[PDB]
Amino acid sequence: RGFLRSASLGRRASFHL
Amino acid sequence: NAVKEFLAKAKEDFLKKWETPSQNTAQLDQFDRIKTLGTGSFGRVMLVKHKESGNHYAMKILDKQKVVKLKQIEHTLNEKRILQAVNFPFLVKLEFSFKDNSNLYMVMEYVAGGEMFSHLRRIGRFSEPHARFYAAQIVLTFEYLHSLDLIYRDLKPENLLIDQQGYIQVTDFGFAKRVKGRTWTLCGTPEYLAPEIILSKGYNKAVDWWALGVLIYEMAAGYPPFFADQPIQIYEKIVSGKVRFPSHFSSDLKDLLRNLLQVDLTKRFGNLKNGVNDIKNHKWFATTDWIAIYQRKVEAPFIPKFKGPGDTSNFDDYEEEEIRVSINEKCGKEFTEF
Ligand SMILES: Nc1ncnc2c1ncn2[C@@H]1O[C@H](COP(=O)(O)OP(=O)(O)NP(=O)(O)O)[C@@H](O)[C@H]1O
Ligand SMILES: [Mg+2]
Ligand SMILES: [Mg+2]
């Protein structure tokens, strides 16, 4: 519920470390 | 007892196909590569057609050298072992599997609709009846996967495929793991991590129910509930325990999300005494016919554009690159197990 930014709406990538 | 014995019989088929996994059962010349459906550092996913049967399938190729390099063999071990031992209408069917020089292969049923991510982003946001339709399939899938001691650990619209009739086909089992107690592997996606995974503590199957609460939120609003400019701010919001709902969220949806997105592990739905029936009996699923969803008798609120077979209109063309083959077997000793 904030100001939407295009980077957060892109395809998210999984990870593991 | 009618559903208690069905899952009990499903655990038998699992443990049977689990102890003695399948073996290589095709050749790469049986399927020609039509177009690339996806790609990545570990490998690629191509749309191939059966030259001996005349039908299309989804061939996921994984570069054997790169898998050894990226420290992911065990994830390819479990993903191949789980995808052959499970069977569910909402899980993908591994039709064929065969190892080769420089590559490993997995022929899965071709899902013609692509990721849910693209449709959600294109449409903007789903309606609550539209999202309730997709959430129910995840609940019945998590109920069946949890009965087999499996944790998915990576629920997000990028790994949810919409089949030809509007139903969900789950694909990515990279972080899937059969475990009875707890686990401590930090994996997933920042926006979907449960607060215990963030605090570097031990977590159980309840993290799959936190992801369901985030997933329902993103489908009904068009954006995840925890997003920020830096990943550290996202981890701060998740553990804080504050969620702001949009104006158009129904009061029943706000209640179900408050139970799913519960930082307190002792109050989170799905991890209580009544188990999965905490969620299926909620007032939000009060229009959902669960047996009709499983039998796939409910009309889908959305059908992917499938005017003809072989159309990748819902996927992205990317760049088409052939697979590099070697004369020297790049198969490591661990790849024998596959
Ligand atoms: N059975 C299938 N039918 C249709 N498309 C598929 C199928 N399996 C995979 N894909 C496509 O291939 C893409 C990659 O899937 P996936 O197995 O998650 O790759 P990955 O190893 O997880 N890399 P990542 O992009 O981070 O998920 C998916 O997003 C789909 O577009
Ligand atoms: Mg994935
Ligand atoms: Mg993955």
Numbering used by the authors:
A (entry chain C): 1968 to 1984
B (entry chain E): 13 to 350
Text lifted from the article:
β-Adrenergic signaling activates cAMP-dependent PKA, which regulates the activity of L-type voltage-gated calcium channels such as CaV1.2. Isothermal titration calorimetry and enzyme kinetics show that there are two Tiers of targets, with CaV1.2 residue Ser1981 and Rad residues Ser25 and Ser272 forming tier one substrates for PKA. These share a common feature with two Arginine residues at specific positions that can anchor the peptide into the substrate binding cleft of PKA. We report crystal structures of the PKA catalytic subunit with and without a CaV1.2 and test the importance of several anchoring residues via mutagenesis.
Upon purifying PKAc, we obtained two major peaks (peak 1 and peak 2) on the ion change column that correspond to different degrees of phosphorylation. These gave rise to two different structures of ternary complexes of PKAc bound to both AMP-PNP and the CaV1.2 Ser1981 peptide at 2.85Å and 2.99Å resolutions, respectively. Complex 1 (C1), derived from peak 1, is likely phosphorylated at three sites on PKAc, whereas complex 2 (C2), derived from peak 2, contains two phosphorylated sites. C1 and C2 correspond to different degrees of phosphorylation of PKAc. Both are phosphorylated at Thr197 and Ser338, but C1 is also phosphorylated at Ser139. Interestingly, despite C1 representing a more closed state than C2, in the latter the γ-phosphate is more readily primed for phosphoryl transfer, indicated by its shorter distance from the Ser1981 hydroxyl group. Our PKAc:substrate ternary complexes contain strong density for residues Gly1969–Phe1982 of the Ser1981 peptide. The P-3 Arg side chain participates in a salt bridge interaction with PKAc Glu127. The P-2 Arg side chain fits into an electronegative pocket of the active site formed by the side chains of Glu170, Glu203, and Glu230, forming salt bridges with all three. In addition to these interactions, both PKAc:AMP-PNP:CaV1.2 Ser1981 peptide complexes present an interaction mode not yet seen in PKAc:substrate complexes. The P + 1 phenylalanine side chain fits into a hydrophobic pocket of the enzyme, formed by the side chains of PKAc Leu198, Pro202, and Leu205.
